Ligand binder design. Structure first.
Ligand SMILES: COc1cc2c(cc1-c1c(C)noc1C)[nH]c1nc(C)nc(Nc3cc(C4CC4)nn3C)c12
Length: 108
């Protein structure tokens, strides 16, 4: 059978990452005012999170699977930009990114 890559990203990849123990800080936009991070939007030009990716997948926002993959990568790299090598959130992001690349590699 054929695989619809955007449906794979929603039903397999996003669903797998969503259930991970480290997923919750990434399930919605970084609320920088509530988290007392007033420079967040100075450093992070294109915020991204899994709640936004889920909504874009559901609303047929993406042209193709690659545009969706680009948003997962922006979410991970924003974390690496704002924070420092070795910080807890970076460790959490690295673990989720490794799982994300595993799931993309598993595409049937
Ligand atoms: C420390 O970075 C975050 C924390 C929270 C978050 C997003 C981020 C975040 C940043 C900054 N850059 O990319 C991401 C991703 N969203 C939350 N929502 C709530 C209600 N509480 C939070 N508390 C939280 C979680 C963590 C974990 C150990 C790293 N530590 N603390 C202070 C965060």
């Amino acid at each position: 059978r054929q695989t619809n890559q955007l449906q794979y990203l929603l039903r397999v990849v996003l669903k797998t990452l969503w259930k991970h123990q480290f997923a919750w800080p990434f399930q919605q936009p970084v609320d920088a005012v509530k988290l007392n991070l007033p420079d967040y939007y100075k450093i992070i030009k294109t915020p991204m999170d899994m709640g936004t990716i889920k909504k874009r997948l559901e609303n047929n926002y993406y042209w193709n699977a690659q545009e969706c993959i680009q948003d997962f990568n922006t979410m991970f790299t924003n974390c690496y930009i704002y924070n420092k090598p070795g910080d807890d959130i970076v460790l959490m992001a690295e673990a989720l990114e490794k799982l994300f690349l595993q799931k993309i590699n598993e595409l049937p």
